[PDB]
A paper describes a structure:
An understudied class of proteins in phosphotyrosine signaling, the receptor protein tyrosine phosphatases (RPTPs), are a family of single-pass transmembrane proteins whose architecture include an extracellular domain resembling those of cell adhesion molecules (CAMs) and intracellular single or tandem tyrosine phosphatase domains. In vertebrates, this diversity is typified by the leukocyte common antigen related (Lar) and its two homologs RPTPδ/PTPRD and RPTPσ/PTPRS, which form the type IIa family of RPTPs. The ectodomains of Lar-RPTPs resemble immunoglobulin (Ig)-superfamily CAMs and include three Ig-like domains followed by four to nine fibronectin type III (FN) repeats. Surprisingly, we uncovered a tripeptide, Lys-Gly-Asp (KGD), in the Dlar FN5 domain that is similar to the RGD motif in FN10 and is conserved in the Lar-RPTP homologs across species.
We sought to gain further insights into the position of the conserved KGD motif in mammalian homologues of Dlar. We thus determined the crystal structures of the FN5 domain of mouse LAR and the FN4-FN6 fragment of human RPTPδ. The LAR FN5 crystal structure was solved by molecular replacement using Dlar FN5 as the model and refined to a resolution of 1.7 Å, while the structure of the FN4-FN6 fragment was to a resolution of 1.77 Å. A similar conclusion can be drawn from examining the position of the KGD sequence within the structure of RPTPδ FN4-FN6. Thus, if Dlar and its mammalian homologues interact directly with integrins, they will use a mechanism that is distinct from the canonical RGD/integrin binding interaction. (D) The crystal structure of domains FN4-FN6 of human RPTPδ is shown in a ribbon representation and colored green. The lysine and aspartate residues found in the KGD motif are shown in ball-and-stick representation.
Author numbering: 610 to 915
């Protein structure tokens, strides 16, 4: 006898497969067809047991398999029955149900401050058996926090993978800098992965704050003193953003490199520079530091008249 023909399987959802067939050629049948049956088995699935669709009407040539596993392969045959019994089963067809969105978050989310206007976030792909498809990209969500609660509107940055690193994305080490942020401000960051079907589960939010700002520029006062010296005095910036910790002075002949670098504590606010000769130009560059670091340098060049 002849089996069903025109076997056609398609997946309309991540958990379903539409099976289609036609009766065997009537000139090649024997008895009258009375029903169809389907055999379907998840290959490599959580449930590897064969399942069946029974009692399909003789005039019915399509049937929807449902409650299948997401993005999973199924091997399928169709069999025609007569009043005698079942005939030979069709050729075997294997297709995979559709992709879905990831049910797991990106793995290993880590955050850290960069400077006063930016933070860094790192992550890896979701657990492979929770992706439900080829990961196509990620979205980093971040919202400004105030007293432990979100204040501003959330923003996002989308990262889309290139075709070249679809295949090795489980080994790619992902990271992103978010800039354009406010000094000394807390942000709550989440990361999602996406497939073609859409966005998946979000990581558990992680807090990260930008650093504080560095101090403003100090003010320089310069005097010509005896024996080819100059008294270099300074005043702290009014904007220190916390306790000042010291100063850094770079000085020497103008354009002549390298300059001499000296550091001072916050308690010191003058220095006598030596080898300051009449008829030459000298540069002084002074920055102030807090625990974050040094602010911009106040830069002054002086020329001693002859």
């Amino acid at each position: 006898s002849a089996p069903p023909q025109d076997i056609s399987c398609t997946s309309p959802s991540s958990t379903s497969i539409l099976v289609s067939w036609q009766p065997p050629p009537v000139e090649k049948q024997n008895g009258i067809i009375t029903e169809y049956s389907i055999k379907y088995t998840a290959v490599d699935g959580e449930d590897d047991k064969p399942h069946e669709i029974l009692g399909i009407p003789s005039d019915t040539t399509k049937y929807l398999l449902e409650q299948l596993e997401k993005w999973t392969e199924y091997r399928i045959t169709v069999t025609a029955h007569t009043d005698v019994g079942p005939g030979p089963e069709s050729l075997s067809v294997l297709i995979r149900t559709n992709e879905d969105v990831p049910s797991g978050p990106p793995r290993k989310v880590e955050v850290e401050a960069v400077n006063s206007t930016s933070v860094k976030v790192s992550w890896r792909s979701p657990v492979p058996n929770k992706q439900h498809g080829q990961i196509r990209g990620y979205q980093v969500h971040y919202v400004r926090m105030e007293n432990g609660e979100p204040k501003g509107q959330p923003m996002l940055k989308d990262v889309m993978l290139a075709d070249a690193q679809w295949e090795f994305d489980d080994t790619t080490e992902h990271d992103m800098i978010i800039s354009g942020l406010q000094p000394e401000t807390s942000y709550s960051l989440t990361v999602t992965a996406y497939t073609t079907k859409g966005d998946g589960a979000r990581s558990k939010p992680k807090l990260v704050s930008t650093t504080g700002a560095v101090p403003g520029k100090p003010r320089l006062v310069i005097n010509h003193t005896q024996m080819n010296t100059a008294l270099i005095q300074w005043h702290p910036p009014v904007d220190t953003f916390g306790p000042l910790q010291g100063y850094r002075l770079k000085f020497g002949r103008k354009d002549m490199e390298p300059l001499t670098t000296l550091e001072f504590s916050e308690k010191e606010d003058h220095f006598t520079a030596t080898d300051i000769h009449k008829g030459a130009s000298y540069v002084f560059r002074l920055s102030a530091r807090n625990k974050v670091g040094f602010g911009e340098e106040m830069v002054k060049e002086i020329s001693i008249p002859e």
